[PDB]
């Protein structure tokens, strides 16, 4: 397995079994040493204040978050960021249906859009009550992050001056979203509570509630 | 006046899965050192030790059946027991139904067995050396 790259002669098959045995002993000791280290007790790359939640946003009850949010922060979110799995994938409608009006009273949004669903995002979040404002453009090849705002950002909380909208890849030929955007937020809201939907373990930064099926 | 270190634990208790945060509320870094879907919960290590008494060392297929409802990895059982028996090769122990109290003795006796002959690594006695 694969059946065609495998040997069929006895001399070829015995030789291969002999080398696999040696190799299982090798990856055995690497797995004991891995588990023991993890066991007693290694530290992950995750910051301590991060707040992961593995759930499916269709199945997830947002009210459980809403209530536990008010219970602890005393306020709804300041900044919400998204990277919808456009159509592993979610029907364009499903994400549209998500109750993101409930989730934030006054603050910003950040939605990542590919050229194919660029227009869709605008009317997706104008539905969410957000007012389209600004576009952050990422150069790797282009991907656009659309920004919106509802209610009042007049409060002193937010900082009007913006880190330059443009942004670059931390590495060359990279596919994960770049970290700088988490400091754009940090300039825009320092130590503000933030939500990320469609998060990923490498999107785990502290101060951030991250919801993702892959967390 | 919003304490984020307390706000983090206070959220993790009410929203995060049982695997992500300790009832303490702090973060369970053991969970992120293993890929998503291949983490080994403690409710799984007790499920295995239990399987050794009812089905013995060799019958992984049968154990995965009763304790893990057919979802666990036969080879991850095959290895996690080596760590229970502190030995790299468990061919000797094939088919022996071993009580949970006999396992620690078998581990301690194989660790100490390992320690003496300097054939011990990573709390595991390597009776097979390549």
């Amino acid at each position: 397995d694969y059946l065609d790259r495998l040997p069929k002669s006895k001399k070829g098959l015995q030789g291969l079994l002999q080398d696999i045995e040696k190799r299982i002993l090798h990856y055995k000791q690497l797995f004991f040493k891995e588990q023991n280290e993890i066991a007693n007790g290694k530290r992950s790359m995750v910051p301590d204040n991060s707040i992961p939640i593995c759930s499916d946003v269709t199945k997830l009850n947002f009210q459980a978050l809403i209530d536990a949010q008010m219970r602890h922060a005393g306020k709804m979110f300041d900044v919400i960021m998204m990277d919808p799995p456009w159509q592993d994938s979610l029907s364009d409608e499903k994400i549209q249906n998500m109750p993101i009006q409930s989730l934030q009273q006054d603050g910003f949004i950040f939605v990542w859009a590919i050229n194919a669903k660029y227009r869709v995002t605008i009317k997706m979040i104008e539905n969410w009550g957000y007012k389209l404002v600004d576009e952050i453009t990422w150069v790797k090849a282009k991907e656009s992050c659309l920004i919106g705002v509802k209610g009042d950002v007049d409060n002193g909380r937010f900082k009007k001056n913006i880190a330059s909208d443009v942004i670059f890849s931390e590495r060359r030929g990279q596919s994960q979203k770049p970290e700088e955007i988490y400091q754009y937020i940090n300039q825009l809201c320092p130590n503000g509570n933030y939500l990320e939907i469609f998060a990923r373990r490498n999107n785990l930064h502290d101060n951030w509630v991250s919801i993702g099926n892959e967390l | 006046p919003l304490d984020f270190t307390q706000y983090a634990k206070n959220m993790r208790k009410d929203l995060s899965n049982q695997d992500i945060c300790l009832e303490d509320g702090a973060l369970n870094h053991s969970y992120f050192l293993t890929k998503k879907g291949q983490y080994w919960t403690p409710l799984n290590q007790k499920a295995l030790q239990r399987g050794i008494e009812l089905f013995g060392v060799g019958n992984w297929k049968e154990i995965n059946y009763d304790e893990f409802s057919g979802k666990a990895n036969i080879v991850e059982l095959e290895l996690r027991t080596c760590m229970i028996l502190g030995i790299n090769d468990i061919t000797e122990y094939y088919g022996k139904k071993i009580s949970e109290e006999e396992q620690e003795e078998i581990k301690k006796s194989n660790i100490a067995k390992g320690k003496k002959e300097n054939k011990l690594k990573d709390n595991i006695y390597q009776k097979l050396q390549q």
Binding site: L13, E21, F31 | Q38, V75
Partner: peptide, 25 residues
């Protein structure tokens, strides 16, 4: 990139297939 577990899984499954062809003879 693979993990240590995933590699051991391929290795065991491979071992089973070859042991099957070694027995088929």
């Amino acid at each position: 990139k693979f993990t240590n577990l995933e590699i051991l899984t391929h290795l065991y499954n491979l071992k089973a297939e070859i042991v099957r062809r070694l027995a088929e003879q």
